[PDB]
Write a protein that binds this ligand. Structure first.
Ligand SMILES: O=C(O)CNC(=O)C(=O)O
Ligand SMILES: [Fe+3]
Ligand SMILES: [Mg+2]
Length: 264
């Protein structure tokens, strides 16, 4: 169902008019090699440390060789102890990028979601229920809708290893219908997702390979979903994290102020 690549918006960063115009029309920005790659490597290594320490991964493996039997069998709460995301998001170099995007001082959510998904290529009964269906972060984050989601790869993604796919320009008609879907679950219970019918033909589904150092960010009403990891050439974990950022002056709601483990 993916029809296109993200547009490389990096050349827009030093042109406020063009940057704002693209974001207004499209509801996303794809920025390449703007984050400190050594900082990103450190986060990736921290995630690996967790997966190794918790018995899921091989201590002899490089990041790209890394694999785990199952996302679900890893203690996610313990993983949050390993991955030092707040120190990353709030590093002056990272903040500089966020500030250039918003054009004003920012506040980074105290909640981050960390994702460490093995390839399930070849699996006859794959476990993809922990992924996300089509949704808008604004459906469950608020009350303010001026936050943006910041999504980063910790190791590179491919079209086959997955990531997040975005319905281009789908952020301009408010929140769309999220209905119960038995194939997506959290805590063993079904979750709500936007049926593909509620996404227009013109709202092209974009997903592109990304490299550590890149950022994908998007509007509260941007309709987006997970792309499953079916990598085999080469087989890669999909290792990423996502938080939300907003203007420093905006109201700070429940998710803004509450760490992932607390709300989980
Ligand atoms: O990364 C994924 O699979 C899903 N991510 C999101 O829904 C997000 O970052 O808002
Ligand atoms: Fe989301
Ligand atoms: Mg609107």
């Amino acid at each position: 169902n993916v029809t296109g690549d993200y547009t490389d918006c990096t050349p827009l960063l030093g042109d406020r008019a063009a940057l704002d115009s693209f974001y207004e029309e499209h509801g996303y920005l794809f920025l390449r090699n703007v984050l400190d790659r050594d900082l990103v490597k450190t986060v990736a290594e921290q995630m690996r440390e967790g997966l190794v320490a918790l018995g899921a991964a091989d201590p002899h493996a490089t990041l790209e060789e890394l694999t785990i039997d199952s996302f679900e069998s890893v203690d996610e709460v313990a993983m949050h102890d390993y991955v030092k995301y707040d120190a990353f998001w709030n590093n002056p170099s990272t903040i500089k990028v966020f500030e250039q995007v918003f054009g004003e001082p920012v506040f980074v959510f105290l909640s981050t979601t960390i994702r460490y998904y093995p390839s399930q290529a070849g699996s006859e009964e794959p476990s993809f229920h922990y992924l996300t269906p089509f949704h808008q972060d604004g459906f469950y984050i608020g009350p303010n809708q001026d936050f943006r989601t910041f999504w980063i790869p910790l190791i590179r993604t491919t079209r086959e290893s997955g990531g997040v796919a975005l319905a281009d320009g789908s952020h301009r008609r408010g929140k769309r219908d999220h209905v119960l879907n038995e194939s997506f679950r959290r805590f063993g219970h079904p979750v709500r997702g936007i049926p593909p019918t509620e996404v227009s033909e013109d709202e092209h589904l974009l997903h592109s390979p990304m490299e550590p150092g890149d950022i994908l960010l998007f509007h509260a009403h941007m309709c987006h979903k997970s792309i499953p990891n079916l990598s085999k050439d080469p087989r890669l974990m999909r290792m990423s994290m996502d938080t939300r950022v907003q203007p420093a002056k905006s109201h700070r709601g429940f998710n803004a102020m509450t760490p992932w483990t607390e709300s989980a």
